[PDB]
Enzyme design. Structure first.
Site, mmCIF file in Angstrom:
data_model
loop_
_atom_site.group_PDB
_atom_site.id
_atom_site.type_symbol
_atom_site.label_atom_id
_atom_site.label_comp_id
_atom_site.label_asym_id
_atom_site.label_seq_id
_atom_site.Cartn_x
_atom_site.Cartn_y
_atom_site.Cartn_z
ATOM 1 N N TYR A 226 0.838 -1.196 0.000
ATOM 2 C CA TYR A 226 0.000 0.000 0.000
ATOM 3 C C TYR A 226 0.877 1.251 0.000
ATOM 4 C CZ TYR A 226 -4.950 -0.511 -0.336
ATOM 5 O OH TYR A 226 -6.200 -0.696 -0.842
ATOM 6 N N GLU B 96 -0.502 4.739 -0.950
ATOM 7 C CA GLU B 96 -1.274 5.935 -1.274
ATOM 8 C C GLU B 96 -0.461 7.194 -1.018
ATOM 9 O OE1 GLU B 96 -4.777 5.666 0.949
ATOM 10 O OE2 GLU B 96 -5.754 4.207 -0.400
ATOM 11 N N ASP C 31 -5.398 12.373 -25.843
ATOM 12 C CA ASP C 31 -5.376 10.975 -25.442
ATOM 13 C C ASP C 31 -4.630 10.181 -26.522
ATOM 14 O OD1 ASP C 31 -5.823 8.340 -24.740
ATOM 15 O OD2 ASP C 31 -8.007 8.561 -24.550
ATOM 16 N N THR D 102 -2.731 5.182 -22.389
ATOM 17 C CA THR D 102 -2.508 3.839 -21.876
ATOM 18 C C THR D 102 -1.049 3.466 -22.095
ATOM 19 O OG1 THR D 102 -3.129 2.901 -23.998
ATOM 20 C CG2 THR D 102 -4.832 3.184 -22.379
ATOM 21 N N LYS E 75 -0.708 -0.465 -25.305
ATOM 22 C CA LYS E 75 -0.984 -0.609 -26.730
ATOM 23 C C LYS E 75 0.300 -0.607 -27.544
ATOM 24 C CE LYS E 75 -5.343 1.323 -25.785
ATOM 25 N NZ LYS E 75 -6.470 1.180 -26.710
ATOM 26 N N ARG F 113 -0.773 -3.038 -18.728
ATOM 27 C CA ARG F 113 -2.045 -2.319 -18.741
ATOM 28 C C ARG F 113 -2.009 -1.296 -17.621
ATOM 29 N NH1 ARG F 113 -4.606 -5.562 -22.362
ATOM 30 N NH2 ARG F 113 -6.403 -4.153 -22.347
HETATM 31 N N1 LIG Z 1 -10.798 5.305 8.409
HETATM 32 C C1 LIG Z 1 -9.856 5.278 7.308
HETATM 33 N N2 LIG Z 1 -8.383 5.231 7.550
HETATM 34 C C2 LIG Z 1 -7.446 5.199 6.436
HETATM 35 C C3 LIG Z 1 -7.963 5.269 4.992
HETATM 36 C C4 LIG Z 1 -9.453 5.311 4.749
HETATM 37 O O1 LIG Z 1 -9.915 5.356 3.655
HETATM 38 N N3 LIG Z 1 -10.380 5.327 5.888
HETATM 39 N N4 LIG Z 1 -7.016 5.203 3.995
HETATM 40 C C5 LIG Z 1 -7.147 4.399 2.802
HETATM 41 O O2 LIG Z 1 -8.154 3.822 2.591
HETATM 42 C C6 LIG Z 1 -5.667 5.905 4.376
HETATM 43 C C7 LIG Z 1 -5.894 7.423 4.723
HETATM 44 N N5 LIG Z 1 -6.585 8.035 3.559
HETATM 45 C C8 LIG Z 1 -6.730 9.497 3.547
HETATM 46 C C9 LIG Z 1 -6.441 10.213 2.396
HETATM 47 C C10 LIG Z 1 -6.577 11.594 2.415
HETATM 48 C C11 LIG Z 1 -7.009 12.235 3.570
HETATM 49 C C12 LIG Z 1 -7.118 13.773 3.544
HETATM 50 O O3 LIG Z 1 -7.798 14.361 4.307
HETATM 51 N N6 LIG Z 1 -6.289 14.469 2.557
HETATM 52 C C13 LIG Z 1 -6.292 15.926 2.442
HETATM 53 C C14 LIG Z 1 -5.396 16.491 3.541
HETATM 54 C C15 LIG Z 1 -3.937 16.181 3.194
HETATM 55 C C16 LIG Z 1 -3.021 16.623 4.336
HETATM 56 O O4 LIG Z 1 -3.515 16.958 5.446
HETATM 57 O O5 LIG Z 1 -1.773 16.655 4.167
HETATM 58 C C17 LIG Z 1 -5.687 16.272 1.100
HETATM 59 O O6 LIG Z 1 -5.268 15.348 0.352
HETATM 60 O O7 LIG Z 1 -5.586 17.471 0.741
HETATM 61 C C18 LIG Z 1 -7.288 11.522 4.727
HETATM 62 C C19 LIG Z 1 -7.145 10.139 4.707
HETATM 63 C C20 LIG Z 1 -5.147 5.166 5.423
HETATM 64 N N7 LIG Z 1 -6.085 5.170 6.697
HETATM 65 C C1 LIG Z 2 -7.888 6.391 -27.262
HETATM 66 C C2 LIG Z 2 -8.123 5.486 -26.038
HETATM 67 N N1 LIG Z 2 -8.062 6.006 -24.797
HETATM 68 C C3 LIG Z 2 -8.253 5.244 -23.688
HETATM 69 C C4 LIG Z 2 -8.516 3.893 -23.843
HETATM 70 C C5 LIG Z 2 -8.785 3.093 -22.582
HETATM 71 O O1 LIG Z 2 -7.848 2.124 -22.255
HETATM 72 P P1 LIG Z 2 -8.425 1.024 -21.170
HETATM 73 O O2 LIG Z 2 -9.186 -0.058 -21.885
HETATM 74 O O3 LIG Z 2 -7.201 0.463 -20.496
HETATM 75 O O4 LIG Z 2 -9.349 1.655 -20.133
HETATM 76 C C6 LIG Z 2 -8.586 3.341 -25.086
HETATM 77 C C7 LIG Z 2 -8.889 1.843 -25.191
HETATM 78 N N2 LIG Z 2 -9.500 1.442 -26.442
HETATM 79 C C8 LIG Z 2 -9.308 0.021 -26.699
HETATM 80 C C9 LIG Z 2 -9.464 -0.117 -28.203
HETATM 81 O O5 LIG Z 2 -9.352 0.931 -28.899
HETATM 82 O O6 LIG Z 2 -9.718 -1.222 -28.751
HETATM 83 C C10 LIG Z 2 -8.393 4.132 -26.190
HETATM 84 O O7 LIG Z 2 -8.446 3.618 -27.486
HETATM 85 C C1 LIG Z 3 -13.348 -0.341 3.033
HETATM 86 C C2 LIG Z 3 -12.466 -0.052 1.818
HETATM 87 N N1 LIG Z 3 -13.027 -0.016 0.596
HETATM 88 C C3 LIG Z 3 -12.293 0.239 -0.501
HETATM 89 C C4 LIG Z 3 -10.925 0.446 -0.380
HETATM 90 C C5 LIG Z 3 -10.094 0.782 -1.619
HETATM 91 O O1 LIG Z 3 -9.335 -0.236 -2.159
HETATM 92 P P1 LIG Z 3 -8.296 0.267 -3.299
HETATM 93 O O2 LIG Z 3 -7.150 0.996 -2.606
HETATM 94 O O3 LIG Z 3 -7.889 -0.951 -4.056
HETATM 95 O O4 LIG Z 3 -8.987 1.215 -4.278
HETATM 96 C C6 LIG Z 3 -10.345 0.404 0.828
HETATM 97 C C7 LIG Z 3 -8.839 0.635 0.864
HETATM 98 N N2 LIG Z 3 -8.334 1.094 2.124
HETATM 99 C C8 LIG Z 3 -6.893 0.939 2.149
HETATM 100 C C9 LIG Z 3 -6.603 1.046 3.632
HETATM 101 O O5 LIG Z 3 -7.613 1.064 4.390
HETATM 102 O O6 LIG Z 3 -5.416 1.151 4.069
HETATM 103 C C10 LIG Z 3 -11.099 0.164 1.931
HETATM 104 O O7 LIG Z 3 -10.503 0.128 3.178
#
Ligand SMILES: Nc1nc2c(c(=O)[nH]1)N(C=O)[C@@H](CNc1ccc(C(=O)N[C@@H](CCC(=O)O)C(=O)O)cc1)CN2
Ligand SMILES: Cc1ncc(COP(=O)(O)O)c(CNCC(=O)O)c1O
Ligand SMILES: Cc1ncc(COP(=O)(O)O)c(CNCC(=O)O)c1O
Ligand SMILES: Nc1nc2c(c(=O)[nH]1)N(C=O)[C@@H](CNc1ccc(C(=O)N[C@@H](CCC(=O)O)C(=O)O)cc1)CN2
Ligand SMILES: Cc1ncc(COP(=O)(O)O)c(CNCC(=O)O)c1O
Ligand SMILES: Cc1ncc(COP(=O)(O)O)c(CNCC(=O)O)c1O
Lengths: 469, 472, 473, 470
Positions: free
Chosen positions: A59, A61, A215, A241, A244, A250
């Protein structure tokens, strides 16, 4: 529990022979046929080794050096290296351009790019899907049905090619932009066989106050190799992308300008671009969660590969292969959109023959000739559009040159000649045309000829000499 | 002159790109020489990884199995079909009553697709507030009104909160809020909530206010598959999930939806059937995504098989036992855990009574090869320096750690926090001053060495340590 | 600390309660009959209309519909509103099983916004005539610079259609082309400064091709429509909105007409399909957008609709059109440029740019000469401050009894005003602050004001007795 | 063509005898019954003379001195006088407040006020309609049906009164505002019988970052007379109708702050309000077209009348009459929301008697007692709500004092007792209950008593014969 070695270290062939068997069959399909989907490629084993790696476990982010999790010492170096190689692959100065390499794929990259610079319901114009644009360029149908979320969360008015020449109608585009006043103009497309007049797009964008996004998903490999016009010269934002013609995993990226804005009447002195923070924020936290670091690492590998002299020679060959195939099809009297090509694909209008694209795509697929039915100008049906799109990137990657693509042309000529003969005997209605496909000796013979031809070429990604079938 | 195919296309990463190869080898080393406590992280299997890194990445396959926009999907269709069937099986679902879409790229795309399927722009949603434990994509905007998630921009969010003293979801307030706000969709499931969910109560609330009920089980999906926590499928219309967390799969998302007849409601036509499938499929493609990532789908099909095994059930039991044992150790030291313990895979640790923020603990731990994440706790406004750290058991449990090893992790964390406290007392609370204590600090060096020694005694799934470039 | 006797505050005339307002109204009355009022959207309504407008009807709350109100006491308000609606249908020769009407909109812009709210969701797509082409603000007006002006371009997604640049006629092919790409939910026709009739049949053909609803805003020509002197939009439109104070010669109010009953045959629509506008349109007016109806307006409107149905009114509407033509012919006899080279309705739109003038200059000088016009956008204008045209309408002065030869005199007064504007501009410069310097102590302006006033006082004045008016000279 | 004198100068009674007869019957109805709709008043003849005047003929889009039409020399002076009398009537410094007097009515004023400061879908909170708020304060129903366009084009979350006391629940409002983060908080209402803690509203708005707007439509006359709290001390924007307690024409007004902003942690020094141009633009050209200048002129008259000592004494009496009516009703054991009133109205909860307001309003209407059924807390039905709203402005304008309003209390007591009897005989169903509204001897006797009572009072809004000299 199970010991780690049993569930966690045992190879796939033992843990899951069912999935392993299907992957081996897909591997055999990929080098036993002619693979002509213009958006497909065969990526390198090295890219695949980074893809299938422990990077999936992390992870990370945030941005390198500014993450929401500990432990990213090396993930940060990987993403930084990927970003810097991306600028290098496209010959960009880091003071003038930045890139976000976290988008999961092309459509997420575009939606993030739009979210960065647009509010809900802001106006966009992109190339109409039947004219060669992509779903995410604001595609709703001529019947007014909103298909892409980019026509749901934003207000799309697409622009079209000239109905008779197939070239973008730049005059209509400018007239439309001046009436509609889009916040963003998108260029680049999925099924346009010509290069883009980015200079004119800039002219138009400036005249109506729009941002300009390209694009380059389809031609990004040709762009890196400097074999087509570079959008970076004129566009504010460039999305793409990476799987291609770029021949990578991907994934998606979003390039954006940085630094001083070019002089423009009505804008303050020392005005600087302000895309970087908005584009980053739109990818994360706005739209995505954790980056897919195995994709970023794989991307970093492909971007190094794309900067090589060999990749540049590959891009030349892709273009030369598409031209040679196109010239072969026209030499049989077939109808290509714009009458030729300048890039990696040809759009082949089948309506002057009498067939829709699903007919020839279905027969071709029976012959291990992989194409895709594709919209052409005027089309209203995605089930049975009027053309097929054929691309050169994938079989070029297997080493094929112009003569081999002329033989591909010959196979397509046969496939279409069979299609018409089956139509002239069993009808134009779909299920009645299906009749001519069961136990068709000429298909079996064409299939046999195609498999024979395909097996004569190398295959990247994996060793033919080790595959199951 | 084109490169021979084998030269660019068949040569190993070690040769093509030594830089990236070396960085991946360093990351493999880092992964087994530390303690990985990020609650959303896991170590997936080598088998998953083999499918993830495969020729499946080459194929465009937009659409559904048997209804594609490209030729050549004879085997992609079988893989996706298999993946969907194992998904239903993993969660003990009747296919007449449940469908699943396994194309979402990750969890956040899965949620935004599920929302786009059933909501128009600006429709009203209600999810767990982020500082209360909910996810970004559950409608997160800050207590200062700042819209953060796109799910607070394209939809109208009104978060619900936990009780300020107890840390449990305030169901009465949620119902009161829901009845005034009238959401189209209520979301349950969380990212930093240490307790189980009263899904039956969420259903009653959702019925009173006319709302759809969606559970995001990303974090606990592994425990759900093993039937070690409440199943959301008994009461929810839609269940989204990621697959790389406690489920131990690739990074992907999944959207489950009901199918078949709807239960009885006054004012409903009789023989009313759910109508989610087409909408949900359409939302994923062609509305939001493009080509599926078939290498993810394949890898997922592998992970779903592994999650349906007896050993995985025992893994899920161990994950919970480890979190509990770790929570008890920390609490025995006087530390504050939100809700005073846990019923799942994680503990949320409120550092504020210690006079600490989580970015300080996170940074110190990271230098000691202890990988955590700072985490918001109730009342936080600063994402930079929130008031908590979040600790999960899935990753280290996958390396074979049991309760006594997690009590050891508790002690290391205790030492980590004590050290953080010592740095702060010497140099000050400002971050620029605190950082001055992180440099050439012998106790950090000492704790790191102790963590690395402990961490090196365990197996590692995903790759052979005997094969890694950096074994020391 | 005591309450005033009722009569003292409540029964005493304006002249004693409020001498300053009374005096200003008397000065406005004097102004109205001692110059030439050529604002195309203005009229002089009748004393009868005005007597209903200023009445105890203002006292009543009557939200809802007749026979379905949210207040008691509406026994007579219901009869007035029913009479107003029935007279509205009759004035436009509508079969009540095919058309209904809502007479509660406060004015024309509320009427349009309600009509759109009834049939559109927020951000739905609309196409109306571009404002510089003659369309109204409420038809989706945003500027050529992209600035959203009307709320109809904020709450809805607007794409205006334009006239041909050289001819000044609506470019129907370009509209059709645009409609097919843009796919509006609603196409608006009718305008504020379009001097020709509308091909409503072509609008229906376009609207059917793109699946749009078709709405006509006849605010300007509603009087001419009631008199059957111009094309009737009801033949082809789903919804027809209008003000009532313009050529219809009533109070300031709006009306929304909408179809009822069976829908005509359309492939794809079910059989026995019926229109469903009534409830939607009523609900948009109330409770969605307005509160209590202004019953004094509805009563006054009922009076105006009766007056609009008379043989005399039809003769009025013929004279309005004849007067506009006579004026236009005079003006282009002097080489002035009228958009479309003439008119088919009550107005002319005069493009001043070939004279090197902007409309605000002509408007200002005219006003000093007791000639009341308005500057007005013409094709290609981007400036609302100094647009390229002036718009002239015949309704108001025709209502005072002017006929063609009187309107030719008006053309001569307009010719003299424009000539003086040119001389002031030549002598004092084209910048506004410099031009203004020539408007002070200007004998020819004095002379022309004097000639306009003496001409103007030779005609009758509806609405009040000039013999009772405070300022008789 | 008809001569001008025929169509254009002939009096209404000859041009249109039908409408003339209906208006005459309506004048007779207004002075022969008891008019208790809280939002109604009887305006002056002077106001009516300005309303029915040649000002209706003028197009004057824009602002005085900056019009889109010629000929506005005098309309500009009328509108300027209207605006400055509006500031004066509410004791406002013109450096600190501006006003726009073009809104056609109250609902237009509010939608324009919101359009000026809000983008589409921005968040608002106003008093819930069953708690006493107006339609235009974001009204959707408890079943989630969007009713007002203010709940469609903007995102509404209403706040409620305490379920058992009927007073606004300020603590829950604050909690809601902190969670919902509205861009705009609205105060003021349509059926709230108590004054408003504008100080607390300001505190709550400052705490969640919202603008604060008061819709004083119902109490504006009491505000001008300084007989209730002034919203201007604490709100950014104040909207109002002019035809209710203010006793003017049907029109709307939008007041807005100007000048230096008060010290606020976060705002740059020398920060100024920036409402004027946005409010003006929202009214025109955004939402309205031509001002209704006869309304502006009539409004200017009413605003001068509202500034007078006699109007101040009227406002006192309104409040005293509502209190006296309220006490009489409670003395009969009836339940009033909040147990009394601080303003011009009482909100009467009919549920403890097994009654809905449509039944009482119907019966009353037959007895020449004009009220309106009215939602009370918890109501979902607009057809058959739980109460009746009673207001003192209109009858007070006819000179009624406390004893007269106690006799009104008794007529109301008789009417409701008679409703509780038509429902024992005939049943609770509308169509059933309705049968007793024909040939009812008690209804006939009550109607006759109400008639006799109403005929004893003066009536504003016609010219007094002796003043026919000016
Ligand atoms: N309860 C909970 N905890 C978690 C997540 C969550 O989704 N839910 N996360 C993953 O699921 C991470 C945290 N995700 C976050 C992302 C952005 C901000 C936010 O407020 N960003 C503002 C402020 C930035 C700053 O203070 O520096 C911003 O981006 O401007 C908070 C949490 C890890 N812990
Ligand atoms: C111009 C263009 N932009 C974005 C995408 C999106 O890529 P993803 O499938 O990964 O989301 C495609 C895909 N087009 C597939 C095709 O032309 O057959 C595309 O042709
Ligand atoms: C409840 C929940 N749903 C969706 C996501 C998103 O998954 P993706 O990062 O693959 O988009 C998270 C990720 N949360 C990451 C964390 O809690 O640390 C999650 O905690
Ligand atoms: N608190 C309050 N009382 C008030 C008003 C108000 O705005 N607020 N009104 C004035 O300000 C009147 C009531 N206005 C209303 C108008 C419509 C609906 C409403 O909900 N109508 C639905 C339901 C129709 C039905 O049940 O038959 C609808 O129109 O569809 C409610 C009240 C008088 N009393
Ligand atoms: C507080 C409030 N605000 C605005 C309005 C609307 O005014 P218009 O009807 O002129 O649009 C009302 C009217 N409510 C009427 C009643 O309470 O009976 C109101 O009570
Ligand atoms: C076509 C049209 N529609 C609606 C309106 C609006 O009427 P209100 O001003 O009552 O809102 C106008 C007024 N336009 C006035 C003019 O053209 O001078 C109009 O011309």
């Amino acid at each position: 529990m199970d010991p780690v070695s049993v569930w966690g270290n045992t190879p796939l062939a033992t843990v899951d022979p069912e999935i392993h068997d299907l992957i081996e069959k897909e591997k055999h399909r990929q080098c036993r046929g002619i693979e002509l989907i213009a958006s497909e490629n065969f990526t390198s084993f090295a890219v695949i080794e980074a893809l299938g790696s422990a990077l999936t476990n992390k992870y990370s982010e945030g941005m390198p050096g500014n993450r929401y999790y500990g432990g990213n010492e090396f993930i940060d170096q990987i993403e930084n290296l990927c970003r810097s190689r991306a600028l290098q692959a496209f010959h960009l100065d880091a003071q003038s351009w930045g890139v976000n390499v976290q988008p999961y794929s092309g459509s997420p990259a575009n939606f993030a790019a739009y979210t960065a610079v647009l509010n809900p319901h802001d106006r966009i114009m992109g190339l109409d899907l039947p004219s060669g644009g992509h779903l995410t360029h604001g595609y709703y149908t001529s019947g007014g049905k909103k298909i892409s979320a980019t026509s749901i969360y934003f207000e799309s008015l697409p622009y079209k090619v000239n109905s008779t020449t197939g070239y973008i109608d730049y005059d209509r585009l400018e007239e439309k932009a001046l009436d509609f006043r889009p916040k963003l103009i998108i260029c680049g497309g999925s099924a346009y066989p010509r290069d883009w007049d980015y200079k004119r797009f800039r002219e138009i964008a400036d005249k109506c106050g729009a941002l300009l996004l390209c694009d380059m998903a389809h031609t990004s490999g040709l762009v890196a190799a400097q074999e087509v016009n570079s959008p970076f010269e004129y566009c504010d934002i460039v999305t793409t992308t990476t799987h291609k013609s770029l021949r990578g995993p991907r994934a998606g990226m979003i390039f954006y300008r940085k630094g001083p804005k070019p002089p423009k009447k009505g804008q303050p002195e020392n005005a600087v671009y302000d895309f970087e923070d908005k584009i980053n924020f739109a990818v994360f936290p706005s739209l995505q969660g954790g980056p897919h670091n195995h994709q970023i690492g794989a991307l970093a590998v492909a971007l190094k590969q794309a900067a090589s002299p060999g990749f540049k020679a590959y891009a030349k060959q892709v273009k030369a292969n598409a031209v040679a195939l196109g010239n072969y099809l026209m030499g049989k009297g077939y109808s290509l959109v714009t009458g030729g090509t300048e890039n990696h694909l040809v759009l082949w209008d089948l309506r002057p023959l009498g067939l829709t694209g699903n007919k020839v795509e279905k027969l071709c697929d029976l012959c291990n000739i992989t194409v895709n039915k594709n919209a052409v100008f005027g089309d209203s049906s995605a089930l049975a559009p009027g053309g097929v799109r054929i691309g050169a990137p994938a079989m070029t990657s297997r080493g094929l040159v112009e003569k081999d693509f002329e033989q591909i042309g010959e196979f397509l000529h046969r496939a279409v000649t069979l299609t018409l003969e089956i139509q002239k005997e069993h009808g134009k209605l779909l299920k009645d045309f299906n009749k001519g496909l069961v136990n068709n000796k000429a298909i079996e013979d064409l299939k046999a000829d195609v498999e024979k031809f395909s097996a004569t070429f190398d295959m990247p990604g994996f060793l033919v000499s080790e595959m199951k079938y």
